[PDB]
Structure 1
């Protein structure tokens, strides 16, 4: 209730950095922030989740911004969890894909 009147609905898009340097304590922290970030999202809010390491793939099956209802968010919170860090960081292919 606080959130819907805080602000206007929003199409967000979470990028996740999956380069090798992140693996460790930091990688562990990211999977819990994104799940946390989602809690914030609402049905009126659309959201997808991407991830980059020298190529930007998209974390799940979706490929476009989806309604971020209870179900869709459940899919994204279940694909954020299985991520493995490997590879070169590329912020240019990560923001092109975004």
Structure 2
């Protein structure tokens, strides 16, 4: 998880994190998904681009960003604070 290792191990990325916020994830798995998305955002550098979306019978951006942003410390702060506010309710629709 060191910056030099991640930087020398693979080329930059256009990551989109698609999170499942349907009802079935409520409880332990939603808390684990929040911690997991934070730890996944911590493996990204300033040459990578990221956005976190969220779907349950309807897909929407989880934050104020609306597209891929530069994945620097401020944008990742925003995405983490927006992920930690997720609540689980609805039907699961993978196609959307």
TM over 0.5: yes
Give 3-state SS (helix, strand or coil) of 1:65's partner.
coil
Where does the alignment leave 5 or more consecutive residues of structure 1 unmatched?
94-98
Residues in 1 aligned to 2:6 and 2:34: alpha-carbon distance in whole angstroms:
22
Give the alignment partner of residue 28 of structure 2, picking from 25, 28, 48: 25
Give the C-alpha shift of residue 58 in structure 1: 0.5
How many residue pairs get aligned? The number is: 93
Deviation of 1:54 after TM superposition, in Å, equals 0.3
Unpaired stretches in structure 2, ≥5 consecutive residues:
none
RMSD: 0.3
CA distance in 2, matches of 1:42, 1:2: 11
CA drift of 1:61 comes to 0.2
Measured against aligned partners, the alpha-carbon deviations of 1:33-54 in whole angstroms (never above 9, x if no partner) come to 0000000010000000000000
Task: Write the distance in 2 (CA, Å) between the matches of 1:63 and 1:57.
Answer: 9
Q: As a proportion of its length, which structure holds more helix?
A: 1
In the alignment, which residue of structure 2 is the partner of 1:96? none
Which runs of structure 1 show a deviation greater than 2 angstroms over 4 or more consecutive aligned residues?
none
